[PDB]
């Protein structure tokens, strides 16, 4: 019953091929490419150990049944949107998912269609079929007809919903970091893990999440295949570099979601404490006009000066994903700013 969320892409147009696998039509269907995936089953170390078990180092998952909700980049603000859910429980189907989540081998249409959970797959499009019927008036059949008879509208409408789901491989290596760590882990979190797990990271931007990934310094091992990150050309090479990445099937894949939460908690403990001190004094200083600008530009230096910030980010950088074996240590942002500026501004 292990549930997977999979961000897919195709070397061709995605919405075209996708709708063409929701009608069981052997006209247009292209290899699905799963480079991003989150697996879950219905404390912090209990969560780490549960995930490290599912994201088996061997490869693929550990559960015997899998419900994969294949998703595209769109808005249901959600960053991805479910397209077709598929239940692989049969031995062969579980075997092909494992070598597509662990090596990056394209999941052929016939396996996408054989496992199609039509009951819940068309439930996502049930409202879409109704609205298209009503609009054009002025189950699988619902779409087979709407597309065969009214293709442009369905394509453009499945293009308005599921917005910008057709981006190219350079787009991914540009917005999801040039590094392999980013390309795997940040794509997993920002798209398929942020909103589901909730927490503060649901409201953080892509650049912020990439910065958090940059400070997630889990021991890097020289890529075995020496595959260049820049060499990646098609969604075939992005997916390969990602699925066989050391950051995708084990401890790092299990520690990243917890580390996002930890880093934010430590940072806000300091940012919020110091914003309270800046807000008490901004409101109760009664100081000179030039001296007010001097104070506020001094307050924010003491709180966010590049050296102080560098020390703080080096104090939250990890060297291991296990929360009970983490190398992160207490940050000296707040304590020092209060012991070097705030008590002396409390000399009011």
């Amino acid at each position: 019953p292990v549930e997977v969320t999979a961000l897919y892409a195709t070397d061709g147009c995605v919405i075209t091929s996708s709708i063409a696998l929701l009608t069981n039509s052997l006209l247009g269907a292209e290899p699905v490419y799963i480079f991003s995936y989150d697996a879950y089953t219905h404390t912090e170390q209990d969560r780490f150990e549960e995930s490290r078990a599912l994201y088996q180092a061997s490869g693929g998952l550990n559960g015997d049944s899998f419900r994969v909700t294949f998703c595209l980049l769109g808005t249901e603000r959600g960053r991805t949107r479910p397209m077709f859910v598929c239940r692989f429980e049969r031995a062969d189907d579980v075997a092909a998912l494992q070598d597509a989540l662990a090596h990056g081998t394209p999941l052929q249409p016939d396996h996408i269609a054989a496992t199609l959970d039509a009951e819940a797959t068309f439930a996502l499009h049930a409202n879409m079929i109704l609205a298209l019927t009503v609009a054009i008036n002025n189950g699988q059949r619902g779409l087979t007809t709407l597309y065969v008879h009214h293709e442009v509208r369905v394509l453009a409408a499945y293009r308005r919903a599921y917005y910008g789901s057709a981006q190219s491989p350079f787009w991914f290596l540009s917005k999801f970091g040039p590094d392999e760590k980013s390309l795997v882990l940040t794509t997993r979190y920002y798209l398929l893990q942020a909103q589901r797990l909730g927490g503060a990271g649901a409201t953080y931007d892509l650049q912020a999440i990439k910065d958090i990934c940059a400070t997630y310094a889990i021991p890097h091992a020289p890529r075995p295949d020496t595959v260049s990150a820049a060499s990646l050309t098609s969604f075939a090479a992005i997916t390969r570099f990602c699925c066989t990445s050391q950051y995708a099937r084990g401890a790092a894949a299990a520690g990243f979601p917890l580390y996002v939460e930890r880093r934010i908690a430590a940072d806000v403990r300091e940012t919020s404490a110091l914003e309270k001190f800046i807000t008490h004094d901004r409101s109760c200083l009664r100081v000179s006009d030039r001296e007010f600008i001097t104070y506020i530009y001094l307050a924010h230096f003491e709180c966010f000066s590049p050296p102080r910030l560098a020390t703080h980010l080096r104090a939250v950088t990890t060297h291991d994903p296990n929360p009970a074996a983490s190398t992160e240590q207490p940050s000296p942002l707040g304590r020092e700013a209060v012991e070097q500026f705030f008590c002396h501004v409390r000399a009011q």
Binding site: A200, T203, Y204, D205, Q207, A208, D211, A214, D267, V268, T271, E275, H300, F304, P306, L309, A310, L313
Partner: peptide, 17 residues
């Protein structure tokens, strides 16, 4: 990389309003 930090953590109150 530290340039974004202040914005990253101060836009959240804006977003939460």
């Amino acid at each position: 990389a530290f340039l974004n930090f202040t914005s990253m953590h101060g836009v959240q109150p804006i977003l939460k309003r």
